[PDB]
């Protein structure tokens, strides 16, 4: 039995209209149930391209290929896909651009009549001491003094909210990077920054107060922790999932190890195929959730 | 002339400005950016490239064969384009993505070995107290406690930078639209959020657990504390130009009076001019900045 998406705001039953600004759809100029209603898997990540290829990709796995309109022609913000129950959407990168797209996101499903929802980033981040190319199924969101917690203000108070990850999930997603054996996939926490460059110890940015010493000390000492691997959406993802109730999952791939490097300089060939690995990995889950009763 | 804080990049055999896809060893800065003088950055990349074609028909670039190629066609995270002393870069939504962007920036004019460069932030942004289409050019970025603070973690330790934007500049653009007399500008503070909906007190989100009068109180204390607008890339601009020695403005219109409403209902017909009065201030002041000398 698959549970109805839930919001916790009361304030949208009341409205005579709900316009999904950063998407441009609106409750007035579309029919969600008849758009979304069906949708079961949503995939996000940074790159509009990335997430057009992903559905091309996912189509051709469960057989559905043959062309595939964004969505959101209306905006530059972001891009979003659809093929069957999977619904694709791009969310730029950082906290802020993420949880942008998850209200309107959930709003979206809420209004579909949405049921029995899964939700998994794919993306890319930096590995601490694994191979380059390593994807990490995240257990933990944490924050970059290692708490698996979520800091937002709220009419200029702190309030905080817990980062972790379904178990099972990740289990299962294990599971199924076990069944492709393509690339290895480890389960790791995942630390999660508001900056790419002073904010994961970077040598490499504008500005740098601090030397690779510093950083190697800061790396090793989030090994320690459990952490595998660095990006920048992990929390809020974790966090606005498990405060609505869905089941969620981060997938990333690992673009360099952090303890040998800042700069990202593998040709861009394997950059490409690095991408395609937590794609693969998801179309794996969705094509066994699928094969199932 | 430009000038990083950063010893370390002095040293590089290359620099790769990954998420611009633009490398010291693949692109020649020098040829290609070094007359830059003033750099202007939104959010959405369809608003920069208008803005940059907008420009150059306004200093008589305005030819036939009129295309401006974005010089990130490489990657979708940022679009960038070019005419004359002119360049125009989108950001994103969020002061991580637009933090990647300055990080990249900033070095990128360095590398230019550009000089009496000029930034300015052209966006949007929710006012307090103002009639909706009105122009805040920001006095100081603040954040949601109303401190001119920007804060970072850096190798786990918590750092904060003064958001101050230059006195002299904001008096200039309130003198251009001024001569413009097309639209109400107001020199004010602006709230700088992470997040869009429980961020600035939005009632439409997808998780909303305070009422009407929370947010009016809050907004009408924001107001009594100067605040003239709420939006989510002041601050680290500020803190990032403040910190280069760069001289940096912010100007961005209101789509909504927030005392009045969350949602952002206006015709596409009137938010599209909306979007276009901060275009027409920064084109006066280039406009004018290049009748000098
Ligand atoms: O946030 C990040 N994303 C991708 C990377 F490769 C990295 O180092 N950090
Ligand atoms: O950050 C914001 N940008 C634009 C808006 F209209 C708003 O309310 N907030
Ligand atoms: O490379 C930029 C970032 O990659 C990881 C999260 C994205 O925002
Ligand atoms: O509408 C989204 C936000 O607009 C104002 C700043 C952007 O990041």
Redesign the interface.
């Known amino acids: 039995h698959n549970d109805l998406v839930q919001?916790?705001?009361?304030?949208?039953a009341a409205?005579k209209?709900?316009?999904l600004?950063?998407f441009s759809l609106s409750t007035s100029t579309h029919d969600f149930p008849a758009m979304f209603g069906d949708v079961k898997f949503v995939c996000v990540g940074?790159?509009?391209?990335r997430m057009k290829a992903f559905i091309k990709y996912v189509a051709m796995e469960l057989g559905f290929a043959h062309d595939y309109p964004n969505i959101c022609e209306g905006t530059?913000?972001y891009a979003m896909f659809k093929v069957g129950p999977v619904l694709s959407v791009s969310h730029?990168?950082?906290?802020?651009?993420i949880?942008?797209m998850?209200?309107?996101?959930?709003?979206l499903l809420?209004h579909a009549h949405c049921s029995g929802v899964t939700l998994i980033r794919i993306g890319t981040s930096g590995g601490i001491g694994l191979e380059p190319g390593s994807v990490v199924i995240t257990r933990q969101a944490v924050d970059?003094?290692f708490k698996p917690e979520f800091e937002?203000?709220?009419?200029?108070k702190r309030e905080v909210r817990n980062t972790d990850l379904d178990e099972q999930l990740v289990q299962e997603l294990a599971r199924c990077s076990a069944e492709l054996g393509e690339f290895p996939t480890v389960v790791g926490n995942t630390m999660c920054?508001?900056?790419?460059?002073?904010?994961q110890?970077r040598?490499?940015?504008?500005?740098?107060?601090?030397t690779e010493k510093?950083?190697q000390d800061?790396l090793r000492?989030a090994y320690a922790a459990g952490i595998r691997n660095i990006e920048?959406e992990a929390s809020v993802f974790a966090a606005?999932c498990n405060?609505?109730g869905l089941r969620a999952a981060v997938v990333c791939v690992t673009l360099l190890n952090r303890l040998e490097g800042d700069?990202?300089?593998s040709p861009h060939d394997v950059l490409a195929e690095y991408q395609q690995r937590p794609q693969r990995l998801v179309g794996q889950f969705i094509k066994k959730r699928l094969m199932q009763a």
């Open positions: 919001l916790c705001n009361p304030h949208i409205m209209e709900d316009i600004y950063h940074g790159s509009p391209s530059d913000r730029g990168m950082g906290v802020p651009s949880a942008i998850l209200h309107e996101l959930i709003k809420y970059p003094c937002q203000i709220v009419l200029g920054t508001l900056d790419f460059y002073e904010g110890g040598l490499d940015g504008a500005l740098c107060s601090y510093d950083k800061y000492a920048m606005m405060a609505c700069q990202i300089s």
